[PDB]
Design a protein around this ligand. Structure first.
Ligand SMILES: [Mn+2]
Length: 1612
């Protein structure tokens, strides 16, 4: 290994030198160097070819390095810190302090006192009262089927006790009894009472922080709290007096105690330190978690969990709790051991150590020994303990207690260890009640970061809007602050008044374990069995080779934890019912000042109630103008940025033009509501991931693994690996020039080409993987093009690339690191059964290796692998689909609350994206500054001119320009991110996006920026992460844990290869069943039946879930109608876009893309929900049960799922609306009729039953019903941003143009703009949306396809036909579209309009039917085993059966393979109808005009085909023509005339029909027959030949559309 490891050997020399050149080796940097060289030695020994001598040398080097690390120890500062809980009686405290001052001679006792939080207990009690009352109100209102006895009794007791406020104890005891009653409530109700209470309290805390923002205060005190209370609840003077009395009493108590102890021990010996004098308290990243802890705490008599951390970090020394006692000395413990005849029960039993410690306390402080509480102790033990105390009371006060070791290892915090004799055995655990550390310790930083992360995870309940409520997770000691358990603890404490911990000893132990693991090799002695070891604690008692532990000479001297005043000891006595309580009536809450919990509109009558007269008379007019727009913005289901910008800008201006305080508060409430709305409306994300690899690392295994994982996560994901060749080329030139400063070209080119070709070939067979060259999609005038041209090399270039590719239209998730899809809940549940929560993250790489690839390793049990193979890969991983981002259009990965640029999730196509434009402009400005600095020609005035007319000028401050000029003079060539950092003082452009937004969104943007300092997530941060880093498997979200809260797996619905319907023939399904649908609905009692069939999804993938969920969002008739119209419009647009292959305007295209992305995300989410029993209750189909649900259990919405389809049942108003996406909806008076109709509809009709998936199946066991426990669950699951599909009627370009009444003059004639757009008027390759100016009129062009469709749909007047012919003649047909022959364009008179319309309708119907017929023929022809080539060559067709359309088709395959069976009754039945109506025409006064026209069209199409004279498709079309001819011959040739032509017979029949009944119908029939008799028109044959020659080859469509176009040609 001396060759490969040679260079690293050089490295080790240098690290040794770094060890040698250390002024202070006892420092962090030296230890870092030590771990670096230890890891290098690890790398050396990991090589397989290592001799035994090298192993021994490495081992002794490791031992020496470990000894050197362990020798570097720090002597802690001589301080002792104790936190004074406001509610602490000094008589029980002072003694302990004296003890700690009599043994620790050279130590100063600092009592940390928070003067401004003396009254905070009452404030949090009032907040808790309000939150619980709100939770009770919402529970009662959300479950109106029954009244709750808990709520009734609770309101009863509160209201009754209002009479006697002085009876607090009477109230608290009755509340304990109330909790005893509450324990018997239903478990789902308990879960809702646990989620609500917590969410409401977090909301109230956030409201208080918002008030702190609006008052512009910097530090929070009691006066601020009292003013907030008076502004949120009516406060009388009595409660203010109570608050002040508590504050004064606390001040007097603390001053008296400190004065007494200072009189005894001296001035400087014991002192008071103010809590507010800590830098960490006001630190922004601590997020004011100290204030939040004051509210979310259940350990009342205990001290704060976060203050001790700050104190240890900023001061160092020893932190102790009040009731800790110094450990017993060696001599005293030895003597008590020998004086009790060897009975160790005295040194283990808690109830006895309590009495002994009480006696020692009384002796040390010269108090009466005989007064020791001796209860629950027998007389014999009492007497022996009495003699014990009398014997110890002779020993020198000095030799009664011991001290501890104040020399601790550098950057380590010892933690006391506690041993307890429970009845079940020995309980050993670490305690945060006694810590050692030193100032500037770094493990304290890790613990503080962990505490902040824990509070973030706790707040995740309210942060995540679409977060589930009902997870019945069992108690598992999860690292997650499991929200349900914490809410339960909080409710229990609020009700009764007296385990799990957010930031207790458990979290501290976890964080120290993680940090010591991160330390590396040298920490191996601080971790044992992947857990905290015995050397990370103090007080560890080694066992004496037996069951019990020897109490003489412990490994480390501890602290007497057991004391008569332990928090869990005296609490049997103190009732604590007055120190921390404030009973305030909540019914008088002022809802208008609470935007978090109540969304209110501008009620102009009551809004200006507390405003002063002058502010009213100045600003009321402007507010009244704002009223309607602001209410519209709030009530909208989408966010339009123009109105938001206008409203917010003018609200901010109004705020700036005011000096009041109440009106300022109301306007700030409006801004808060706006910001919350911005937070709520999330937009979907496209199923696209774009990885920008760094093509220089030695291994690409991570890239392949990431691509495989994202391919396996979902079968529709699109993956784009964007690499740039110019960037690599310029990097090569830069390396060669740097080498030249102080041959390989072919090697480098081969290396890059080989890597790119290898990644291309590994995923060659997958179409979803696209290897892209970035310098092939960017415009030449773009900033990136200039960056490549100049030779930009700086490492941030790729980040810029990402931003550019988002502005180019490439949406999705852009990333550089090799992301992996997050593991689903199923994989985690599988892994949990054989692993703990801390090993799952370690074993996940092996599981992913087994899922994506097929490798297995012995490090994982076989049963795990077998369980993993039983599930599909897409059921174990989370795909990119189903995600959502902020409406501002960009989200970023988070790292401890700071958003970074590892992952950029950029909205969805078609949605508004302001950040795109902002970053585009910013990148341009940075480029301009960079280029002007490149030549050194930048000065202050130029810098001002560059950024004018730009938002980035908001960063133009004097210090920023000064720094920019200084850095420009120091080094002219700086990367764009360096320019950004100089200009703004921000780390990343992601941080600058919000500041750029504030320009156009002032006030709201500033508010959202200010909320980041107060616990609220950044608005541009993704919360739920579906990705994990490949090297550490940590989610990239803000407040998520991938292990304990992994997302549920989504069920994927897979359908058969053959599609029963395609887009062309889909309307057949609606047409043939609509009438029977209506008849069934009307016969089952329906009174309102509406038909709005959908055409968005013609296949059953997703079981039409998406659409159904949309119909489930509506709660009102009006919203339902608006949604129905919008959906019909989008469906028509879809048919126009893809069935006809017609271009659309930009607005319509964006609307279609928005609706489609929303539908796909909704379908994914719905399919995920229905399969997970924790969220929606699923029941088998039973009419009585469902009626009981809809009548008794208060269920208002339900999803009825068949195997292949989904129906929606609602309870709008007082009627039950059953919605079928393919058939519209029906309205029923009672649920039972709706259920009967659903049963009949899905059961009776055979084609319906087969298509829905219920053929030959019992409907009582294959139809499921999914419903919610409470209606609010739907409000929690369904997204709020509908893209306006439910509130506002989206308008297509045609509707907008139809409103304009000004005509446009083209080619000398004037026609309306709507008609000009209809005929396909395009400017430079884009359909017009506005009246063209006179200059652009010559540039207009006519789209051939749109004009052809318009002609085939419209019955023009002769004058209009002349106008269109003239316009086409003077403008021409746009190149690449369908050429149109002017002879085709004609017009009809008034009397022949109905006939022409019916003919066009029949043409469409025949197109749709023949499409299905030809698909059937292709399917029948493809299942025939065919050898090499396409020589099927149908020998002979013959019509066999007359009633079912049986055609015997001999196939002359050459191998005598003959399939004489096919069922095509659509062709035969029309001719049967025509013949039977012709024969009985003299005896029937009925004439079917539509049937005649359809038959005429079919025979004309067959004539064109056969006159025109070798794969499956064209052969099947020729076969179809043959069967049309044969059926006509069979039905119209009554006698066997050899000289029989179908056209002549059909024409003669039409002529006889026309001559039997006169009129315009007869004239039209005669004209059709006349056309049939004569030879085909020259122009007709010309257009047919032109199509079949050039147009079919030009188009890439399948063959069905070409056949439909030909039959349309025939009908025209
Ligand atoms: Mn305690």
């Amino acid at each position: 290994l001396k060759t490969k490891y040679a260079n690293e050997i050089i490295e080790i020399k240098r690290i040794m030198g770094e060890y040698n050149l250390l002024p202070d080796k006892n420092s962090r940097n030296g230890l870092k160097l030590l771990q670096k060289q230890a890891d290098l030695l690890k790398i050396i020994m990991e090589d397989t070819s290592v001799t035994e001598n090298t192993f021994k040398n490495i081992e002794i080097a490791i031992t020496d390095i470990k000894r050197e690390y362990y020798s570097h120890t720090v002597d802690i500062e001589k301080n002792i810190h104790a936190i004074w809980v406001a509610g602490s009686p000094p008589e029980s405290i002072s003694d302990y302090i004296k003890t700690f001052l009599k043994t620790y001679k050279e130590f100063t006792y600092y009592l940390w006192v928070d003067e401004k939080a003396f009254g905070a207990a009452k404030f949090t009690s009032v907040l808790k009262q309000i939150a619980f009352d709100l939770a009770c109100r919402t529970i009662q209102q959300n479950t109106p089927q029954k009244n709750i006895d808990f709520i009734n009794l609770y309101n009863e007791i509160r209201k009754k006790y209002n009479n006697n406020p002085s009876g607090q104890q009477e109230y608290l005891n009755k509340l304990r009894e109330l909790y005893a009653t509450y324990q018997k409530i239903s478990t789902p109700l308990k879960h809702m009472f646990n989620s609500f209470f917590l969410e409401n309290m977090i909301k109230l805390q956030d409201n208080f922080f918002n008030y702190c923002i609006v008052k512009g205060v910097t530090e929070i005190n009691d006066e601020l709290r009292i003013n907030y209370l008076k502004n949120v609840i009516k406060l009388s003077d009595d409660d203010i007096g109570n608050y002040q009395k508590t504050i004064n009493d606390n001040k007097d108590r603390v001053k008296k105690l400190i004065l007494d102890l200072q009189k005894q021990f001296g001035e400087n010996r014991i002192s008071i330190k103010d809590v507010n004098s800590l830098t960490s308290l006001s630190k922004s990243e601590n997020n004011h978690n100290y204030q939040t802890e004051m509210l979310l705490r259940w350990n009342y008599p205990a001290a704060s969990d976060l203050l001790r951390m700050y104190i240890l970090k900023e001061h160092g020394g020893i932190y102790t709790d009040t009731d800790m006692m110094p450990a017993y000395s060696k001599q005293v413990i030895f003597k008590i051991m020998m004086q009790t005849n060897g009975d160790n029960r005295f040194l283990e039993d808690l109830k006895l150590r309590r009495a002994i410690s009480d006696g020692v306390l009384r002796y040390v402080n010269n108090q009466n020994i005989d007064e020791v509480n001796y209860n629950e102790i027998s007389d014999a033990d009492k007497n022996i303990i009495k003699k014990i105390l009398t014997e110890i009371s002779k020993m020198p006060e000095d030799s009664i207690f011991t001290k501890i070791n104040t020399r601790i290892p550098r950057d380590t915090m010892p933690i006391l260890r506690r041993y307890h004799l429970w009845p079940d055995g020995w309980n050993i655990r670490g305690l945060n009640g006694f810590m050692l550390s030193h100032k500037g310790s770094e493990v304290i930083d890790a613990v503080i970061a962990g505490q902040n992360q824990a509070y973030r995870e706790l707040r995740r309940i309210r942060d995540n809007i679409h977060s589930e409520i009902y997870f019945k997770q069992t108690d598992e000691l999860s690292s997650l602050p499991d929200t349900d358990k914490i809410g339960g603890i909080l409710v229990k404490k609020y009700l009764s008044g007296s385990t799990l911990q957010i930031s207790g000893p458990d979290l501290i132990q976890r964080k120290m374990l993680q940090f010591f693991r991160s330390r590396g090799v040298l920490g191996e002695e601080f971790i044992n069995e992947r857990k905290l070891s015995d050397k990370a604690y103090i007080g560890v008692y080694k066992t004496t080779g037996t069951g019990k532990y020897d109490w003489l000479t412990p490994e480390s001297i501890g602290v007497n934890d057991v004391t008569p005043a332990d928090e869990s000891t005296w609490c049997i006595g103190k009732g604590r019912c007055v120190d921390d309580f404030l009973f305030k009536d909540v019914s008088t809450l002022k809802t208008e000042n609470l935007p978090e919990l109540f969304l209110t509109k501008i009620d102009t009558d009551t809004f200006f109630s507390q405003w002063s007269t002058k502010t009213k008379k100045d600003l009321q007019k402007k507010i009244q103008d704002l009223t309607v727009r602001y209410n519209e913005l709030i009530d909208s289901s989408t966010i339009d940025f123009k109105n938001l910008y206008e409203i917010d800008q003018m609200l901010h201006m109004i705020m700036l033009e005011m000096n009041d305080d109440i009106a300022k508060r109301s306007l700030f409430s409006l801004q808060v509501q706006i910001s919350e709305k911005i937070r709520r409306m999330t937009i979907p994300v496209d199923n696209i991931i774009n990885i920008y690899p760094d093509l220089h690392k030695k291994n690409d295994n991570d890239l392949s693994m990431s691509i495989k994982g994202f391919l396996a996560s979902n079968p529709h994901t699109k993956i784009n690996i964007l690499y740039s060749n110019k960037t690599e080329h310029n990097i090569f030139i830069k390396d060669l020039f740097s080498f030249a400063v102080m041959a390989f070209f072919k090697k480098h080119n081969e290396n890059i080409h080989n890597k790119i070709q290898r990644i291309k070939d590994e995923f060659k067979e997958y179409s979803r993987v696209a290897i892209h060259n970035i310098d092939k999609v960017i415009f030449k005038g773009q900033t990136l093009d200039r960056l490549y041209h100049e030779g930009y090399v700086f490492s941030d270039i790729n980040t810029l690339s990402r931003y550019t590719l988002h502005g180019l239209g490439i949406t999705g998730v852009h990333t550089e690191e090799n992301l992996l899809p997050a593991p689903s809940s199923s994989l985690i549940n599988i892994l949990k059964e054989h692993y703990n929560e801390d090993e799952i993250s370690a074993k996940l790489p092996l599981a992913y290796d087994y899922i994506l690839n097929k490798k297995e390793s012995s490090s994982i049990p076989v049963e795990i692998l077998n369980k993993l193979s039983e599930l599909p890969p897409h059921e174990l991983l989370t795909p990119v689909l189903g995600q959502s981002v902020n409406p501002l259009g960009m989200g970023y990965s988070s790292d401890n609350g700071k958003i970074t640029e590892q992952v950029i999730v950029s909205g969805a196509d078609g949605f508004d994206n302001p950040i795109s434009g902002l970053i585009y402009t910013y990148l341009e400005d940075l480029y301009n500054i960079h280029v002007r600095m490149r030549e050194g020609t930048l000065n202050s005035q130029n810098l001002r001119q560059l950024l004018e007319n730009s938002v980035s000028s908001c960063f133009l401050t004097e210090q920023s320009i000064n720094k920019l000029l200084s850095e420009a003079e120091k080094r002219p060539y700086q990367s764009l991110t360096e320019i950004h950092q100089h200009l703004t003082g921000l780390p990343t452009i992601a941080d600058a996006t919000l500041s750029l937004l504030s320009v156009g969104l002032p006030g709201t943007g500033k508010l959202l920026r200010r909320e980041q300092d107060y616990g609220r997530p950044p608005v541009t941060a993704i919360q739920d992460s579906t990705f994990v880093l490949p090297y550490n498997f940590k989610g990239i979200g803000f407040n998520d844990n991938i292990i304990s809260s992994a997302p549920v797996a989504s069920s994927l619905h897979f359908i058969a290869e053959h599609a029963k319907y395609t887009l062309l023939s889909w309307p057949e399904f609606y047409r043939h069943h609509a009438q029977r649908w209506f008849e069934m609905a009307k016969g089952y009692g329906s009174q309102n039946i509406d038909f709005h069939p959908q055409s968005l999804l013609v296949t059953q993938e997703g079981r039409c879930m998406g659409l159904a969920l949309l119909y489930l969002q509506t709660e009102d008739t009006a919203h339902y109608s608006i949604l129905q119209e919008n959906l019909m419009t989008v469906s028509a647009l879809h048919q126009t876009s893809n069935r006809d292959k017609l271009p659309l305007s930009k607005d319509d295209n964006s609307l279609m893309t928005r609706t489609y992305s929303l539908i796909e995300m909704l379908q994914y989410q719905g399919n995920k929900y229905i399969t997970n029993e924790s969220l929606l209750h699923k029941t088998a189909w039973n009419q009585e049960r469902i009626t009981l649900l809809f009548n008794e259990k208060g269920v208002k919405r339900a999803l009825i799922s068949t195997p292949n389809h989904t129906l929606v049942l609602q309870q709008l108003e007082d009627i039950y609306r059953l919605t079928d996406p393919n058939f519209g909806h029906a309205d029923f008076l009672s649920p039972i009729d709706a259920l009967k109709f659903i049963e009949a509809m899905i059961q009776l009709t055979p084609t319906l039953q087969e298509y829905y998936g219920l053929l030959n199946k019992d409907i009582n066991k294959h139809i499921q019903v999914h419903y919610a426990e409470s209606d609010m669950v739907w409000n929690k699951l369904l997204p709020e941003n509908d893209a306006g599909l439910s509130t506002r009627i989206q308008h297509t370009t045609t509707d907008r143009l139809a409103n304009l009444a000004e005509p446009v003059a083209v080619a000398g004639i004037s026609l309306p703009v709507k008609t000009l757009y209809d005929i396909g008027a395009t400017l430079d390759g884009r359909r017009i949306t506005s009246p063209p100016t006179s200059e652009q009129i010559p540039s207009l062009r006519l789209n051939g396809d749109v004009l052809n469709d318009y002609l085939s749909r419209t019955v023009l007047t002769p004058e209009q036909a002349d106008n269109i012919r003239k316009i086409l003649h003077t403008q021409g047909i746009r190149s690449g579209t369908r050429p149109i022959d002017p002879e085709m364009i004609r017009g009809t008179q008034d009397d022949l309009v109905s006939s022409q319309t019916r003919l066009q309708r029949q043409a469409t119907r025949v197109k749709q039917q023949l499409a299905g017929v030809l698909d059937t023929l292709q399917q029948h022809f493809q299942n025939i085993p065919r050898s090499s080539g396409r020589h099927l060559s149908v020998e002979n067709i013959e019509l066999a059966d007359i009633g079912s359309g049986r055609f015997n088709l001999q196939i002359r395959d050459g191998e005598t393979l003959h399939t004489t069976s096919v069922e095509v009754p659509e062709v035969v039945s029309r001719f049967q109808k025509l013949s039977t109506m012709l024969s009985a025409l003299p005896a029937s006064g009925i004439m079917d005009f539509d049937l005649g026209m359809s038959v005429v069209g079919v025979v004309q199409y067959a004539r064109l085909l056969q006159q025109g004279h070798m794969d499956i498709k064209q052969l099947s079309e020729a076969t179809l023509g043959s069967m049309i001819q044969i059926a006509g011959n069979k039905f119209l040739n009554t006698e066997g005339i050899q000289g029989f032509r179908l056209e002549s017979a059909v024409a003669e029949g039409m002529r006889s029909v026309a001559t039997r009944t006169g009129g315009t119908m007869g004239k039209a029939l005669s004209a059709s027959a006349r056309v049939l008799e004569l030879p085909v028109l020259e122009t007709v044959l010309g257009t047919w030949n032109l199509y079949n020659s050039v147009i079919q080859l030009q188009q890439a469509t399948s063959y069905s559309e070409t056949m439909a176009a030909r039959v349309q040609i025939a009908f025209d």
